[PDB]
Amino acid sequence: SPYLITGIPKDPKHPLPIRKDIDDWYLEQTSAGSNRIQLTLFVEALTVIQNRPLNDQLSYFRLAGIHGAPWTEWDGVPGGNPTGFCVHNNYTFPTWHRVYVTLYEQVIYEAMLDFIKQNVPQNGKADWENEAKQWRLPYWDFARFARHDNTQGDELRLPILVTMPMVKVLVPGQPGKQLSKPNPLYRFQMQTLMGTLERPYAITDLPFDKCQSTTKYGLLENYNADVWADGGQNWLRANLALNEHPWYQNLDGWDSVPTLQDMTFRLLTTGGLNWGEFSSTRYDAPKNWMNLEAIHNNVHNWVGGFMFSRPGRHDLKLWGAGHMSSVPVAAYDPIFWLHHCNIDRLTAIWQTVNSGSWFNDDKSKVSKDDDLRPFHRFCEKTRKVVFFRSDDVKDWRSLNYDYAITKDASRIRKEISDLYGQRTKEVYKDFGEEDYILSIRYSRYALGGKPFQINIFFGDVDGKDFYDARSQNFVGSVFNFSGVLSVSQLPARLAVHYYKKQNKGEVPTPRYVVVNSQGKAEAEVKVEVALHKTEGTFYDADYRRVADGKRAEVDDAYRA
Amino acid sequence: GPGGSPYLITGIPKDPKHPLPIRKDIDDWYLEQTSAGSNRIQLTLFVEALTVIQNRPLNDQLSYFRLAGIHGAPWTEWDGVPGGQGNPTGFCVHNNYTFPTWHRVYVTLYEQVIYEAMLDFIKQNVPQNGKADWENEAKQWRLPYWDFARFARHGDELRLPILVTMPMVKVLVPGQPGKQLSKPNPLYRFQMQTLMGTLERPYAITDLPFDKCQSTTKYGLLENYNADVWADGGQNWLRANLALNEHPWYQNLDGWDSVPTLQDMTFRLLTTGGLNWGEFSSTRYDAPKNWMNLEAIHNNVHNWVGGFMFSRPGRHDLKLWGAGHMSSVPVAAYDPIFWLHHCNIDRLTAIWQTVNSGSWFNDDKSKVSKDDDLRPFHRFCEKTRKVVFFRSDDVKDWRSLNYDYAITKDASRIRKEISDLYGQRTKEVYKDFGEEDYILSIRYSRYALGGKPFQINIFFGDVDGKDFYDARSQNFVGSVFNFSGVLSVSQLPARLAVHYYKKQNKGEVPTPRYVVVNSQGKAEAEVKVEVALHKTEGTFYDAPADYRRVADGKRAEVDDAYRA
Secondary structure, X not given: OOOEOOOOOOOOOOOOOEOXXXXXXXXXXXXXXXXXXHHHHHHHHHHHHHHOOOOOOOOHHHHHHOOOOOOOOEOOEOOOOOOOOXXXXXXXXXXXXXXXXXXXXXXXXXXXXXXXXXXXXXHHHHHHHHHHHHOOOOEOOOOOOOEOOOOEOOOOOOOOHHHOOEEEEEOOOOOOOEEEEEOOOOOOEOOOOHHHOOOOOOOOOOOHHHXXXXXXXXXXXXXXXXXXXXXXXXXXXXXHHHOOOOHHHHOOOOOOOOHHHHHHHHHHHOOOOOXXXXXXXXXXXXXXXXXXXXXXXHHXXXXXXXXXXXXXXXXXXXXXXXXXXXXXXXXXXXXXXXXXXXXXXXXHHHHHHOOOOOOOOHHHHXXXXXXXXXXXXXXXXXXXXXXOOHHHHOOHHHHOOEOHHHHOOOOHHXXXXXXXXXXXXXXXXXXXXXXEEEEEEEOOOOOOOOOEEEEEEEOOOEOOEOOOOOOOOXXXXXXXXXXXXXXXXXXXXXXXXXXXXXXXXXXOOEEEEEEXXXXXXXXXXXXXXXXXXXXXXXXXXXXXXXXXXXXXXXXHHHEO | OHHHOOOEOOOOOOOOOOOOOEOOEHHHHHHHHOOOOOOOHHHHHHHHHHHHHHHOXXXXXXXXXXXXXXXXOOOOOEOOEOOOOOOOOOOOOOOOOOHHHHHHHHHHHHHHHHHHHHHHHHHHHOOHHHHHHHHHHHHHOOOOEOOOOOOOOOOOOOOOOOHHHOOEEEEEOOOOOOOEEEEEOOOOOOEOOOOHHHOOOOOOOOOOOHHHOOEOOEOOEOOOOOHHHHHHOOEOHHHHHHHHOOOOHHHHOOOOOOOOHHHHHHHHHHHOOOOOHHHHHOXXXXXXXXXXXXXXXXXXXXXXXXXXXXXXXXXXXXXXXXXXXXXXXXXXXXXXXXXXXXXXXXXXXXXXXXXXXXXOOOOHHHHOOOOOOOOOOEEEEOOOOEEEEOOHHHHOOHHHHOOEOHHHOOOOOHHHHHHHHHHHHHHHHHOOOOOEEEEEEXXXXXXXXXXXXXXXXXXXXXXXXXXXXXXXXXXEEEEEEEOOOOEEEEEEEOHHHHHHHHHHOOOOOOOEEEEEEOOOOOEOOOOOEEEEEEEEEOOOOOOOOOOEEEEEOEEOOOOHHHXX
C-alpha cells in the first residue's frame, strides 16, 4: 500500500503480449502437444489469490469487493443506499473497468511468479517464467459462436473452462504427471456463508447473505435455505439466455439470429457516435443509443439470472437468480473478469475504428478528468502517488497488453464482420432493404435502485408468460443492472418483418412489460419505447419514428 | 474377503437399548437434524462415515466404489464370488421375482458398512467423554429413504431430497463445542481422482461416455460440448425434479389440475389388492389390471433422476435432454442417490407385504425363484452353522435385519397413511370427473434393442414428429422406461388423459399411439410394443370397498430426421 497498478512489466523478449480468447486459449493449452504451463499457472495462481485472507487487500474477495459489497476501504481509500467504487451510468464506465481488469491481471501475474519461485525446481524456472511473462488475462468472447469439432458452431456459450468443476494441471518437477484440481474459474467459494464473515466484510432481497459460493441461476424461492449455500452453476440455462432472440424464430421455417451478436455487430460497425453515446447508458438520435454499457448489462443478467421466483404454478422452471445479475455481488463470480475483459476489448476495437472520438462531446468532456478511485499510480512528473485518470489508459498498450484484433488492425472491419456480422447479414439479406430499431429510455432508479427487466413484444402479450424468448411475441429485453436517465437500443428488423407478414404489412405497436425479481409486472415503472425505421440495411451504411410503445397488462396474479 | 473371511451381512447389531430403529424419510431427517430441537450428530456421522467409505482404495471391497461395483460395471468379483458374468452383467437381479429381495439385502449391506464406519469415526475422533453419547446416536441411525412419491415439504411437487441438492453440508467438529464446518457433501455426487475409464485394472469403467467421467452426474452428459465437460457434468437437480413430476401434456393447459404420474402409480401399486407376488415384484412376464409393479416404478425413477438421452436431432435452443449415471444399469449405483432410492423401494415392498400378508413367492411362476442364491451376499446360517448365500425367505421379515419403517409399525393405520402420503392429490383431482377408471397396459422385450435402453412414450391424438419425448410434447400421456444395458410389463394411469381427449373429441375413446425413443432421441421403428387401453366402472381407490379392453395401440410415425 499503495498498490501501484502498472499492468504486467515490460520485457523486451515479450513485446505487447495479447489477451487471448479463453476458448482458443483453453483448447491450445489442453492439446496433446502443448506444455500446459499457462493453464497450470492461471489455475494455481487464482487458487492462491482466492485463498488469501480478508485482511489481504490482494485476496480475491477484496479485489471483487472493490466493485460493490461489502463496500469497504481498499488501498487506503475509504468505502461506505450503499454504493461501490465502480462507475455505472457515466462516461467513465469503459475506463474505470479498463483499470479494474488490469489490476486483476497484474495480481494474477504476480501470484504466478510467486508460484514459480516456490514450486518449480530451478532447472525449469526459466521456461515457466517465460510462459508467465507471455500470459495475459483471457477474454470471454460472448458474441462469438462457440466452436463445434474445430469448426464454427451456431450458438453463443459460456467459456468451456467456466463450465468445468475440475481441471487437470501439471505437477512441477514430475514430467508427464497431471492432477485434477478444483477449478477456480468455476465458482468462488468461501469457507462460510458470506453473510457471516467477520466485520466489516459480511455480505448483508436475493439471499446472497446465505451463499457460501457464487452461483448462476441457483437461487430460487421455495427451496430449503441450505440449498442457497451453493446453488450450483447452471451453465446450460445461462447459455440459453445468452442466445436470446425474437420469439417467432422458434417457429418452423425461420432462421434465428442471437440478439446479443446483432447488438454487438451494430455497436462496432455504426459510425458517427461520439464518446458519450458509445461509452455509457447515460442520457443527459435513437440510432445512436446502442452503447457498450447496455450490452454489458444484458450479459450480466443472462449469465447469472435475476428472478428469484415466479407467480403461479410451473413444472418447467426457467427462473433462478445468481451473482452476475446483481451489482453488489457480480464481481465475486470469476466469469465477471472474463466478461469485463471482453468489454475492454470491445472498447479497444471501437476506439480503433473511431480514433477521433474520446471524451469529445460536450457531455462526456466534463467527466474526462474524474479520478478513477480507488486505483493508484505513480506520477513521474510530480513524483506523487495519484489516482488513475481516463487519459492515462486511452492507449491500452501503455498497460503492456493488446488484443490480436487491434494488434494488426489492418483489416479490423473485415474481422468484425467475420466474427459478429455473418449470421446477421445472412438472415437479413432474405428480406427488404430497410432497418428497424427499438429505442428504450428509462430511469435506473425507477424501483428505488432495485433491478428490473424491460421486455418488448409485437402483438398480444401472454398475461402469464412475458419473460423471454419462449414468451409469445417476445422481441427483446433491456436489463437495468442496478442495486439523469439511461438508454438502450434493440434490433427490430427481423421481428418487424414477421409481424408484417402476419398482419397485412401493418407496423407493430411495441408493447412493453417491466418485470421485477419476483417475476411480477411493475405497472408504474416509466419506460419510453419507440420503433424507428430507415431505408437500406444497417451494415451497408436517417431514422424516423413509426410507432410509440404501449404498456401491456398482465394477469392479476402476476401484477406487482 | 481378506484372509478368506466373508463379509457377513446381518444388518446393524441388535442392542436391547435400541429396539427396531426406523429408517426415516431423508427430508424429515435432514430437517430435524438441522433444527433447533436436534444435536446434529447423525448428520455429522453419516457425512463423515460416507466420506471415509468413498475415499477407501479400490482393493478394499468395502470402499464405496466396490460396493457400487456389486451392482454392475466394472463387473469384478466381490467377497470371493467371481464376477465377469453374451453381454456383461452384474450381480443385480432385474426382470425376475427376486428383484425386491436381492435389493433388500444390498441396501442392508450399504447401511451396515456405513454404521461400522460411524463407529470407527467415533473411536478415532470423538473425545472420550462424548464417545458413549455418539455411539448411541450411531446405534439409533438407520439409512434414510428418499420418498420419491411424496410431495416435498413446504408441498405441491415431487423433488429430489434436499441433501442430495447441496454441494456442501455443515457438520459438527467433535471436541470443539459449538463449532461446525462446511464440508463436501458425499450424497451430492461420487467423485474419483481420475476419469473412471482410466482406473487400474481390473476396475476401469470402459454408448454414453461414462469412461470419460470422473464424477457421477445427473443430466450432465450432452453431445456437442467439449469432452472435458463430461469429467464432471454437474447435478442438474432442477431438471431431475421436472422429470419426476411427469404428467399428461393436457394438464399444463389453463384450467386443468395436474397429478404427478409417479404419485398416482405409487398410490395404485400400494392400494390395489389381489396381486400375487409375481405380479407385484417385477416387470417379468412369463390381466393387465395387475401389471402395475414395483420394478417398473423403480425403472422410471432411475430414468427421471439421471436422464438417458445424450443427443437430439435438429437444432433446439432449449435443451431438455442430457444423460447421467442413474439411468444406466452398469453405473447407476455410483450415484449416492441410488441407495436412497432403493431404500424407498425396500420400504414400498414392506408396505405392500403388510397389506398383502399371504402373497409371498406364492404363485406358480414366482415360486420357482424363491430359493435362488442372492449372490454375492453371505450370512451365517444358525440352523446349519455354515456360511451361505442369502435367500429370499431370510429377508421376508425385514425386521430380522434390525430396521423398521414408521409406516409399517401399525397395520391398522397403514391404509390412512398410504392415503395421506400418496392419495390426496389423485382423489382430489379424479373426484371432479365421472366414476370410471382407465389404464394403459404396456408389454415389451427388454432386449428389443440388443440390450440398449429405450423409452416408450404414449400419446392420445396426433403426435408431433419433432417432439415426442415428455410432458411438454403435445398429447403426451405417459412413459415406460426400459432400464437395461420372457417379456416385461408395466401399467400407466390413463383416467385423466382419457377425460381430456373425450372432451376434445365428442366422447370418442382415443387410440393410444406410441413411439420408442433411443438415447440419440430418435424413434425406433422395429421395437415391438403391445399397448392397450382398458376401462372399468368405479374409481380405483374406492374399489377395495374387472377391466375391459377398449382400444389397441399403434405406433406413431415421426419426422424423417428423427427416425433411427
